[PDB]
Design an enzyme around this catalytic site. Sequence first.
Site, short mmCIF file in Angstrom:
data_model
loop_
_atom_site.label_atom_id
_atom_site.label_comp_id
_atom_site.label_asym_id
_atom_site.label_seq_id
_atom_site.Cartn_x
_atom_site.Cartn_y
_atom_site.Cartn_z
N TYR A 1 -11.18 -6.17 8.86
CA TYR A 1 -11.86 -4.94 8.49
C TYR A 1 -13.33 -5.22 8.23
O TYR A 1 -13.93 -4.68 7.30
CB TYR A 1 -11.22 -4.29 7.27
CG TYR A 1 -9.76 -3.95 7.45
CD1 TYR A 1 -9.36 -2.67 7.81
CD2 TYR A 1 -8.78 -4.91 7.26
CE1 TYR A 1 -8.02 -2.36 7.98
CE2 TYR A 1 -7.45 -4.61 7.43
CZ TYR A 1 -7.07 -3.34 7.78
OH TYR A 1 -5.74 -3.04 7.95
N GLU B 1 -3.99 -5.23 12.82
CA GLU B 1 -4.56 -4.18 11.97
C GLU B 1 -6.07 -4.16 12.17
O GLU B 1 -6.73 -5.18 11.99
CB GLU B 1 -4.24 -4.41 10.49
CG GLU B 1 -2.81 -4.11 10.08
CD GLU B 1 -2.60 -4.21 8.57
OE1 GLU B 1 -3.60 -4.23 7.82
OE2 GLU B 1 -1.43 -4.27 8.13
N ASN C 1 3.84 -10.38 5.67
CA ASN C 1 2.59 -9.68 5.92
C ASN C 1 1.60 -10.01 4.81
O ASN C 1 1.95 -9.97 3.63
CB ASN C 1 2.81 -8.17 5.99
CG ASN C 1 1.52 -7.41 6.23
OD1 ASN C 1 0.77 -7.12 5.30
ND2 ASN C 1 1.24 -7.09 7.49
N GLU C 2 0.36 -10.31 5.21
CA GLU C 2 -0.78 -10.61 4.36
C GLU C 2 -0.42 -11.34 3.07
O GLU C 2 -0.58 -10.78 1.98
CB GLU C 2 -1.52 -9.31 4.01
CG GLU C 2 -2.22 -8.69 5.20
CD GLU C 2 -3.11 -7.53 4.81
OE1 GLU C 2 -3.07 -7.12 3.63
OE2 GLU C 2 -3.85 -7.03 5.68
N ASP D 1 0.81 -1.21 0.00
CA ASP D 1 0.00 0.00 0.00
C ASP D 1 0.85 1.27 0.00
O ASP D 1 0.58 2.18 -0.78
CB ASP D 1 -0.95 0.01 1.21
CG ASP D 1 -2.24 0.75 0.93
OD1 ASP D 1 -2.47 1.14 -0.24
OD2 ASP D 1 -3.04 0.93 1.87
#
Lengths: 595, 583
Positions: free
Chosen positions: A462, A498, A406-407, A163
Amino acid sequence: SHMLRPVETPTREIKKLDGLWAFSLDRENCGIDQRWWESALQESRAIAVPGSFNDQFADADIRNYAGNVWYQREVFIPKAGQRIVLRFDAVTHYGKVWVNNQEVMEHQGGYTPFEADVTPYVIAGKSVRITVCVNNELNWQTIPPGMVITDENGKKKQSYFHDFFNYAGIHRSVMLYTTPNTWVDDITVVTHVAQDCNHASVDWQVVANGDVSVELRDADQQVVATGQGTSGTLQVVNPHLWQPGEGYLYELCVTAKSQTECDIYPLRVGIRSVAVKGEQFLINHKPFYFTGFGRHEDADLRGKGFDNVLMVHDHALMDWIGANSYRTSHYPYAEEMLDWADEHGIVVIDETAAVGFNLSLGNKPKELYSEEAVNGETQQAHLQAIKELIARDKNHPSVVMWSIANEPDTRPQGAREYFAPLAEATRKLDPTRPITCVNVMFCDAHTDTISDLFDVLCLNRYYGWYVQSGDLETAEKVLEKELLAWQEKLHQPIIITEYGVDTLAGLHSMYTDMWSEEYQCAWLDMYHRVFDRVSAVVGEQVWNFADFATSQGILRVGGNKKGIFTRDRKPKSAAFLLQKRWTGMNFGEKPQQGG
Amino acid sequence: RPVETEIKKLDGLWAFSLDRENCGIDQRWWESALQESRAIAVPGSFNDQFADADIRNYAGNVWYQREVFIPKGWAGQRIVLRFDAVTHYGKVWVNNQEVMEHQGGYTPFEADVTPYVIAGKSVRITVCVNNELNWQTIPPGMVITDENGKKKQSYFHDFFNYAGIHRSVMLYTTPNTWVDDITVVTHVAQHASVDWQVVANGDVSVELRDADQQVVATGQGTSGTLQVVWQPGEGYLYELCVTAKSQTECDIYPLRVGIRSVAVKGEQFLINHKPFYFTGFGRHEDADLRGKGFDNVLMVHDHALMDWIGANSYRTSHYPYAEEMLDWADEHGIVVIDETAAVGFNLSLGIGKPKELYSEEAVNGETQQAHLQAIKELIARDKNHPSVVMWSIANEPDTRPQGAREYFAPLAEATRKLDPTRPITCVNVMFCDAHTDTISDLFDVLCLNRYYGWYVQSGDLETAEKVLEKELLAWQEKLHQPIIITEYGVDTLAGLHSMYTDMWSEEYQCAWLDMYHRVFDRVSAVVGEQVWNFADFATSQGILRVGGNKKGIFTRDRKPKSAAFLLQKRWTGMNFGEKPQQG
Ligand SMILES: CCCCCCCCC[C@@H]1NC[C@@H](O)[C@H](O)[C@H]1C(=O)O
Ligand SMILES: CCCCCCCCC[C@@H]1NC[C@@H](O)[C@H](O)[C@H]1C(=O)O
């Protein structure tokens, strides 16, 4: 190799970190051909180090430039007969250094330091020219990986999968340090505790043909233990062990003597023991609770460059808000941040730069784990980044976790084939700390196939934002359900690393709908309600201290706006909600299922 | 539309109530005063009115109610109750007796209430408004339910689904010989205007004037009417008095009409036999606080902004506007592309469900019928307006799955047979370019929505210019038709500035509107430009909408962004009605 942070003693540093270097672009790749190392800067201009070259000139054509940039700097040499070494604490992605027409060393790390021994090649008393070739490109074997795309004009356009914006250049210190010819160039320290009453701190180091006599001095320079040998343990008594609250720090001074020359190196370590038991993260045999941020090395003008005012101010903000922990998000942070975390007792989840191993976050390759994308060489490079990160941050008591990646998209067959050897290798590299892999959202408990190899389950969720857009009544049910499913599956301590929502700092609405500050508050609040009734949730970490810069997209309004603070460090309305919650609870303890 | 020679019942406040348990029609709530009611304002959408989050998204049955006094002067005349617009569905009751119902939404519906009403005493009026959308509503949608009976509506257009009573409610009186239907068609060569009439027990005597009662022609009959010998600048419009005579009572109805004939020639749009160039906005019926409710202050102000910025035309985007906008539109002579609520016939616009768009479970049968109905009503209300130069059946439909052409051909045929005096169009979506679209041949003018540099090639001007150019001239070589770009715009935060002129900043809206205008200038077939939205407007909740759609030249409270002065320089710097000669 081995990595020791330099420090002033009968040792010396000339901070070449001085700004105002000569900077130029290489839009034609004539630099390596036309021997730019030789002399002048050609058509350069003033730049400042440390600092990213993208945002420093307010030119868009520079900030998106994908290729080779040239740094340049003449300097004088004060230390004679000392080993003089040139250290770059961070040159993002690729950097090749030249000392007066001669290649010294190069690196392909990005956020890890690399140095070189330059004693023969320099003469203390005259000038010397240092030309750095910095490459900012990402292919499939870089960490992080990427795809560079040329078009019909040969113009390179860099596309990636993370990102944050791909800020590049020299980001941390460039220094010229000076050590005796019998140095102490590697150290490792492991600490144990039993019942906060007594235990040992094993020692281990690597020399330059010298012996090591090691003393353990106090916070007021009091010897408490000695030792003679390259290995072995040594015991304290009734220690002032390192706690997340205060953070007591012993000063272990190591000595490597030769028949003529000697070197003394002071290394600060704190007595603490971190382990995972069932669903509890134990620091010094006490169950912990993580609170804090997943922040970025991001700011106005300097990009990912380092600066001290940001450190003291950011740490003042986190100190005020009640945060006790953070996670060096998506790349190794500057070692200074970890020194601060060492003295001030800030628990840190350390992470490598392995981010973006995921093609479902919306000419992309069709299989994520094939030979055309993420192959054996990507695995080798990933193991490299792990090696370097651990070799740099091994002794810091504030690091309580290693985070390999990460992810990553773990649905495809082969993700386990790629990540399992890296878990084995990382466990073999540093056995004193738990290991983790931050979990993507669309790999919930019923489709993931990787979280078994790691000690702590980190989650990025999220619910209510990307899915169930605007629905709190439903995102509560979904979030709680998947949390209890992760519990029923792995029985691990679950840190949510997160959870956040975008918020225009100044957007208000009576309906508490998305993008307003009221929605940020109500959303974090409901997420906290779910967090408090799950026994295995051993930590919460909001998605992000402050808004940061991203690539241009239709989901990023001037970058990511999921920050508690703005980019200039101004609090949104939710910062005071988090103030109430975190500063109201008992330190290092999980709420008693309700206030 | 009523005049006289009435008591506007929309005055003041009405009683408003929700029906969460859905007890209203069963327990006969109209036969009594609403239990636990609260004051509501008409005209105005009920969603934004109370700052209540639960009221704003409520999907079900809402109940309006208001007592009124029927004036004594209307003793033996027919008393008619007119609802200028009740959004989506409405069933109206007059004092214990059910009178009317309508599933239109953006078009009026009236009913004769002479028996049920005794002029002199107060009667109660109860309206049941429904805001639900299935596959047979225009626009289409689909509702979902779960445990606890919480209904949640999902639709496929962008703008927020505001509902309620949005325009005035009238209660007019006409003598027992009324003029129910009128039609007028004007011609002009290098002319005159046939007249029409439908009445009951009355003869037709037609005369027409200009400035004031200065007749310059006449006629006695339901045909012909031709005699002596309306511009986009001023808009000269004659006054056509229609007379319906009976043995006892007489009726007189004035209809303003402007002489104009619109037709497409090759790749030119001819209004009064002159090539034109469209400039202006595709706006919305949206406002702070009142939803889609109409209000005169807003119409005056927005028309002031459009006049200042140099706009000469606009499109009633995605639904029929309030007819006051069209009366003003032919008064000041602004060109209007009228459009139906047919929007959202697409499953490809996904924020990042049936399996095929033209199956039986979605868009088939009553969907096509009711679409033809929305046509029939839009035309039956806006046929006589000289400001309406174009028909627009639908907006951004997915014409790629099997069966789209089979759907859109009959609607084009029937619509053309209904009003042959005006060209017809269909605004197609971006995902269907010249090599994949299969419907742009059925229509007279091709309308285009293009967002190169935003959704695809995001932030890259240098290539979005090439793709827009190639697509444009490829359209021109493909169909040799007039192409109006009816949507082109990018989102922009009102206060966000950036030295790098990257996305969401005002500099990017300026530089992005400029390149599109150069590519517009080097294409001969482009007969007009309409920047996407006039003002920022409210949409459903998504991760792509930062408190609504930010693609407006003005903000929601009507404050200009950096592009408003750019466009005011471009549109007023050129000659009115003319396109730049490639620069
Ligand atoms: C197909 C289902 C996708 C589920 C949503 C995935 C969201 C990933 C969130 C992203 N996680 C990574 C982090 O660096 C980013 O800042 C964060 C974000 O974009 O806010
Ligand atoms: C290749 C196509 C990529 C996706 C293009 C999507 C275009 C949709 C256009 C949409 N048309 C409907 C209008 O109300 C909306 O404001 C507009 C939008 O996007 O905001």
